Amino acid sequence: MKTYHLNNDIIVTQEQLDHWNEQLIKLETPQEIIAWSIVTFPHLFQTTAFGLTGLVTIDMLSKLSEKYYMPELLFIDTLHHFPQTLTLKNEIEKKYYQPKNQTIHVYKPDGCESEADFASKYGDFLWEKDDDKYDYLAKVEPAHRAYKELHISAVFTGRRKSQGSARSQLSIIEIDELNGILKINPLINWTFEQVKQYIDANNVPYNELLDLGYRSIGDYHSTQPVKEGEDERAGRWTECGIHEASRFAQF
Amino acid sequence: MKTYHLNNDIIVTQEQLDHWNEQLIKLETPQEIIAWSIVTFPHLFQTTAFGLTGLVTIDMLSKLSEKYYMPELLFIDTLHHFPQTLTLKNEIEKKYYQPKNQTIHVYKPDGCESEADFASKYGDFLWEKDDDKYDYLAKVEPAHRAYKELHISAVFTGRRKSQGSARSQLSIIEIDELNGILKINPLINWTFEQVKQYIDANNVPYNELLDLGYRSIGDYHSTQPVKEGEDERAGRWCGIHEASRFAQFLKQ
Ligand SMILES: Nc1ncnc2c1ncn2[C@@H]1O[C@H](COP(=O)(O)O)[C@@H](OP(=O)(O)O)[C@H]1O
Numbered sequence: 001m002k003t004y005h006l007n008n009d010i011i012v013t014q015e016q017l018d019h020w021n022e023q024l025i026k027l028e029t030p031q032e033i034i035a036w037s038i039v040t041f042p043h044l045f046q047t048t049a050f051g052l053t054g055l056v057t058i059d060m061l062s063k064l065s066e067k068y069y070m071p072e073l074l075f076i077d078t079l080h081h082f083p084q085t086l087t088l089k090n091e092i093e094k095k096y097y098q099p100k101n102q103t104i105h106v107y108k109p110d111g112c113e114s115e116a117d118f119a120s121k122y123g124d125f126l127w128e129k130d131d132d133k134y135d136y137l138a139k140v141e142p143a144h145r146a147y148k149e150l151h152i153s154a155v156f157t158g159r160r161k162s163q164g165s166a167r168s169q170l171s172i173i174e175i176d177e178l179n180g181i182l183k184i185n186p187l188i189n190w191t192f193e194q195v196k197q198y199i200d201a202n203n204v205p206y207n208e209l210l211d212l213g214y215r216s217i218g219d220y221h222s223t224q225p226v227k228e229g230e231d232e233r234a235g236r237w238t239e240c241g242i243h244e245a246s247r248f249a250q251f
Numbered sequence: 252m253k254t255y256h257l258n259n260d261i262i263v264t265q266e267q268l269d270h271w272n273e274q275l276i277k278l279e280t281p282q283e284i285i286a287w288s289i290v291t292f293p294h295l296f297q298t299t300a301f302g303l304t305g306l307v308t309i310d311m312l313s314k315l316s317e318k319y320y321m322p323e324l325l326f327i328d329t330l331h332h333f334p335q336t337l338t339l340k341n342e343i344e345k346k347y348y349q350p351k352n353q354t355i356h357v358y359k360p361d362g363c364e365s366e367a368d369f370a371s372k373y374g375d376f377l378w379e380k381d382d383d384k385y386d387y388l389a390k391v392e393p394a395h396r397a398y399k400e401l402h403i404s405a406v407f408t409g410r411r412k413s414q415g416s417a418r419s420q421l422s423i424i425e426i427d428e429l430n431g432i433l434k435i436n437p438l439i440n441w442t443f444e445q446v447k448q449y450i451d452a453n454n455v456p457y458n459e460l461l462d463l464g465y466r467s468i469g470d471y472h473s474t475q476p477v478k479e480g481e482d483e484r485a486g487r488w489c490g491i492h493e494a495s496r497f498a499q500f501l502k503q
Pocket residue numbers: 047048049050051052053054055074075076077078139156157158159216217218240242
């Protein structure tokens with residue numbers, strides 16, 4: 001019997017993991033997956049970069065929070081975001097978190113408070129010279145420090161099957177044992193049309209860059225706009241290091 | 252922190268237990284608690300003595316099974332049930348389980364087939380001669396054996412807060428580490444009236460003895476009826492849920 005060791009001394013067997021993925025596919029809406037997750041998991045957080053998918057989840061959690069509670073939000077500040085991502089964060093904190101006496105948890109690369117700090121520590125243009133090392137220092141390390149310090153056992157992610165590449169192989173529930181977390185992907189089965197429809201119907205704030213072509217937004221230096229025909233994440237071009245953690249299992 | 256070891260290598264922390272009890276209170280219907288349990292726990296069964304509360308659960312599970320599935324049913328035959336309890340067991344099997352390709356699981360005292368076998372093993376009238384011996388051999392042992400053999404991690408029980416006495420302090424979810432099971436009490440917040448209303452509205456088969464005054468039904472020798480201003484359970488004074496005292500026998 002394979003068992004998974006998680007933060008806060010939680011243990012999950014393969015049978016439990018398999019059982020959840022078998023039963024949860026029977027749920028008709030992401031709101032149902034989210035409601036179940038809320039009831040089922042203590043130490044439950046959302047991670048977001050304020051991508052459109054995760055904004056939908058924030059709004060869904062907000063509607064569900066009246067009956068239940070609002071799971072806290074974790075955002076990794078890579079120090080290389082578009083300013084527009086950061087202003088959206090403030091907008092989101094004001095709208096959804098401040099009213100509930102919460103602040104968004106923000107984690108940064110260790111010992112750095114700015115892009116210049118980062119370049120001082122590791123050299124200029126690191127994302128060009130060593131994408132792996134950059135990925136680890138900008139996002140993987142801060143996220144891992146966060147899970148451990150904030151005692152996170154489970155997280156919502158904004159990943160979907162229709163985003164393609166490695167994400168078409170996604171399950172509703174996953175285990176990242178290296179980080180000591182369970183991941184829930186409640187909009188796994190939602191298309192981008194569905195995500196946008198929800199954003200529009202519920203007037204949730206979204207990144208201004210979307211009105212300029214940015215259907216997917218990462219770092220200012222590694223993100224380009226895309227036309228309505230191209231892949232959702234074509235302006236980003238390999239799975240992001242925070243989801244594929246095993247390549248940084250040494251550090 | 253406190254962690255509980257269940258059957259099937261399943262482990263529950265106190266924080267998980269406390270979180271479930273805190274959130275499940277916010278649910279509005281027993282059906283929602285039931286739906287959640289189905290999704291959450293593998294190796295989920297229902298235990299019943301075919302008491303009125305557990306019958307509601309059976310029908311509720313029946314309707315939910317179309318979308319989900321039907322958790323199997325476990326009945327401990329103590330060999331000292333009222334005949335009509337056994338007659339009701341047949342009606343329920345035929346109505347709810349047969350059409351779903353199931354039989355009701357029936358566990359009896361070890362090495363015994365009937366009341367006469369029991370009496371030839373341990374002597375006549377064991378319940379009045381040694382109640383600890385009786386409760387163990389007739390109820391606790393067979394139940395324990397069933398949890399182990401059927402690899403049960405979690406059960407629905409038909410206990411409610413409104414049933415009075417110690418049941419006033421009941422939680423939605425509790426843990427029985429000695430048996431290696433989690434216990435879910437989905438109708439915890441329902442009154443007998445609510446239970447009776449569902450039984451009536453959905454034409455669920457119930458014990459005939461309930462019309463003859465009885466409100467709670469146990470063994471034939473240890474079950475009295477109740478009057479007007481008396482408690483629903485004030486007529487059979489369990490062990491099946493107080494298995495903790497038999498620890499020295501169960502810790503194997
Ligand atoms: N900087 C960051 N901070 C926190 N979570 C992040 C993150 N970057 C990515 N993620 C997680 O990974 C998901 C995929 O992001 P991307 O599609 O940009 O690769 C994000 O969904 P959302 O940003 O939609 O909530 C989020 O759940």
